[PDB]
Amino acid sequence: LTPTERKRQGYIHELIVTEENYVNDLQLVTEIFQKPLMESELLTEKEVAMIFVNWKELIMCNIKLLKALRVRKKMSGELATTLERIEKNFVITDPRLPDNPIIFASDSFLQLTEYSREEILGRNMRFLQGPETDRATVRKIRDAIDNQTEVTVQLINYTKSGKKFWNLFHLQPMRDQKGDVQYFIGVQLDGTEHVRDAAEREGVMLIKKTAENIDEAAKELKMPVKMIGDILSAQLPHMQPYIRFCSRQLNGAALIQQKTDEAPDFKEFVKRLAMDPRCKGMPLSSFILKPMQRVTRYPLIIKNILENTPENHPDHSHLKHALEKAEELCSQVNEGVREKENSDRLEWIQAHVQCEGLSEQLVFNSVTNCLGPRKFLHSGKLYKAKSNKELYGFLFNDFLLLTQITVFSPKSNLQYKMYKTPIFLNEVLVKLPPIFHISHIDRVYTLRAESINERTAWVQKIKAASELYIETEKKK
Ligand SMILES: Cc1cc2nc3c(=O)[nH]c(=O)nc-3n(C[C@H](O)[C@H](O)[C@H](O)COP(=O)(O)O)c2cc1C
């Protein structure tokens, strides 16, 4: 197969494999961090929500994505568990990608070489080699790869600290139906001395049998993929919850750090939850950064697939739209991160304005229907004329919310009850007769501001945001 078509499959599976690991990490935090902390009675219901936020919603998005990938790949969820049951030292590499990167490494291997998964994935396996390593033995391994054949040799490798150990290494290519090599299997039998005769014969049989079990486990993964863009193009516009989480990931991380330095009982309970072998000795404050890393990873992956996809290919069109949506999703995420002050205000409104009786729950710190990330514009007291009913209004870029007090200060706690249905700015006109009038098609609202300078602030901001809404809706 051509290197272009070859790199294509490597990048499509780069998307699938990394997604498996990512979704797996999301389910871990919910399993061994979220639920335990909720039932520990160490933190209040409010403090927990300030950290995880919409973590549950993040999983609901990627699961729908991952499941769709699995059906197309004809996979089951068993691959991860099936590989873990093989308690042997081995890795899997992808020759379709430059310098033959490592895409998987067993727990036994990581503990043997004292390396972590993050330090290994994406890099070539040659890091094990050192000064006392037979460079002639190494060449035999390279030739086996170039000829796409199996080989079994013995050489000296080094750990992370630099510990020497003999390596009864076995190489074996993984092939599909057409005999095309998709991956390489590398089994390592560590030892202190060079094995000969019976000692060598027994070791070879074990590492070869191990290689066969791995080939059986990764059987569904070996098969090539025809199309993948149509799936990405259908799921990416539904990655909305990321924008809220990434806008609050900074405050959520600072909450954990602050709570640790003021509560020793909390610090101990967290590290005892990081006791998990699937955590790989990695703290909770690090899993929070993963969603931000993942959304910025998509445009890099999709582009690699797109560049290795010809124009006449039926998947080329879907990858184009997928790349656009991935970048639009990434852009809106970065905007939420930058607009820090706007993020805190929307979340404050969420926890102080009781909105009930709607067809769908109202999330202020979220995405609008057409204008993207919601933005707070103006607030203040508003008196409805001919009634003089004291109401407090919140102006957003897409709608205006009228409430009733039962401002953005962290300590002061006022509770706002929802007054009427949120009036969207796509159907309202504003004119002047501190009294101002807004023109809804069905009914006419007559409100009075706190002062003259306030009315001019209301009229201008409502009008400017209304015209921005209309012209945006006229684009499509
Ligand atoms: C699946 C796989 C596993 C490998 N495992 C080892 C290993 O455990 N130790 C080692 O020295 N080389 C290992 N290699 C070989 C190196 O990755 C590399 O191909 C070899 O050292 C030749 O390096 P070179 O391209 O710079 O000549 C493995 C290769 C593959 C494909």
Q: What is the DSSP string of 21-32?
A: HHHHHHHHHIII
Most ligand 1 atoms within 8 A of CB, residue of 103, 132, 138 to mutate: 138
CA-based nearest residue to 188, from 99, 118, 280, 102: 102
Q: How many of the other CB atoms lie within 10 Å of CB of 14?
A: 22
Residue 145 Cα: closest atom of ligand 1 = 31
Most ligand 1 atoms within 8 A of CB, residue of 103, 126, 147, 164 to mutate: 126
- Amino acid identity, position 334: N
CA-based nearest residue to 33, from 254, 244, 293, 279: 279
What are 464's two structure tokens? 């400017």
Q: Quote the CA–CA distance of 51 and 258 in Å, as a whole number.
A: 12
Q: Quote the CA–CA distance of 354 and 360 in Å, as a whole number.
A: 13
- Going by CA atoms, what residue is nearest to atom 5 of ligand 1? 186
Q: How far is the CA of 142 from the centre of ligand 1 (A)?
A: 7
Q: How far is the CA of 125 from the centre of ligand 1 (A)?
A: 5
Most ligand 1 atoms within 8 A of CB, residue of 104, 125, 171 to mutate: 125
Q: Quote the CA–CA distance of 188 and 346 in Å, as a whole number.
A: 54
CA-based nearest residue to 96, from 189, 18, 207, 173: 173
Q: How far is the CA of 23 from the centre of ligand 1 (A)?
A: 30
- Going by CA atoms, what residue is nearest to atom 25 of ligand 1? 142
Residue with tokens 């014969």: 201
Residue 102 Cα: closest atom of ligand 1 = 1
CA-based nearest residue to 108, from 126, 137, 87, 133: 87
With a 6 Å cutoff on the Cβ, whether 145 touches ligand 1 is yes
With a 6 Å cutoff on the Cβ, whether 154 touches ligand 1 is no
Q: Quote the CA–CA distance of 407 and 183 in Å, as a whole number.
A: 60
With H, G, I as helix, E, B as strand and everything else as coil, classify residue 402: strand
Length of the chain in terms of residues written: 476
Resolution in A: 2.6
Residue 185 Cα: closest atom of ligand 1 = 1
- Amino acid identity, position 192: T
The method recorded for this entry reads X-ray
Q: Quote the CA–CA distance of 72 and 70 in Å, as a whole number.
A: 5
- Going by CA atoms, what residue is nearest to atom 2 of ligand 1? 186
- Going by CA atoms, what residue is nearest to atom 4 of ligand 1? 186
Q: How far is the CA of 85 from the centre of ligand 1 (A)?
A: 24
- Amino acid identity, position 120: I
Q: Exposed, middle or buried: residue 108 (CB in 10 Å: 0-12, 13-18, 19+)?
A: middle
- Cβ–Cβ under 8 Å, residues 337 and 260: no
With a 6 Å cutoff on the Cβ, whether 270 touches ligand 1 is no
Integer-rounded Cα Rg, in Å, for the chain is 29
With a 6 Å cutoff on the Cβ, whether 440 touches ligand 1 is no
With a 6 Å cutoff on the Cβ, whether 186 touches ligand 1 is yes
Q: Quote the CA–CA distance of 64 and 240 in Å, as a whole number.
A: 13
With a 6 Å cutoff on the Cβ, whether 128 touches ligand 1 is yes
- Going by CA atoms, what residue is nearest to atom 22 of ligand 1? 142
Distances (CA, A) of 51 to 69, 106, 291: 30, 32, 13
Q: How far is the CA of 184 from the centre of ligand 1 (A)?
A: 10
| Bridge partners of residue 391, in order along the sequence | 382
- Going by CA atoms, what residue is nearest to atom 31 of ligand 1? 184
- 214 CB-side CA count, 13 A: 28
Residue 187 CA, chain-centre distance (Å), reads 31
- Cβ–Cβ under 8 Å, residues 298 and 61: no
Q: Which phi and psi (to 5°) does residue 280 adopt?
A: 60, 35
